[PDB]
Amino acid sequence: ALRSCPMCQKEFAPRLTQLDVDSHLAQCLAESTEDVTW
């Protein structure tokens, strides 16, 4: 589903696979000092 990252608002282009998106999300979550929900 996700069309943009809920943490950093980067837009997810259609060329990105689900794996790419999950990987991006993981990095954004890890970089945040607090636990985030979305």
Binding site: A1, L2, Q18, D22, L25, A26, Q27, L29, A30, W38
Partner: protein
């Protein structure tokens, strides 16, 4: 069925699971293999942070699916 859990350093953990296994079960398996306490694990798949009480099938996780694992340090 086999799934993969990928860490941020690129390491891949392979797990045998059932579609009805809960996310907590999965974290416990990760602990068994890697020694990481579940409370320090966060899992991501299909645009979602996976919740402990839900099942793999709830998230459409299937054979050879790749989940992403993020670790947290203890706080305090």
């Amino acid at each position: 069925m086999q799934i993969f859990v990928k860490t941020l350093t690129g390491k891949t953990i392979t797990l045998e699971v059932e579609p009805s296994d809960t996310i907590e079960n999965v974290k416990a398996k990760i602990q068994d293999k890697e020694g990481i306490p579940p409370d320090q694990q966060r899992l991501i798949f299909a645009g979602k942070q996976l919740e402990d009480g839900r099942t793999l099938s709830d998230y459409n996780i299937q054979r050879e699916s790749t989940l992403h694992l993020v670790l947290r340090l203890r706080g305090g």
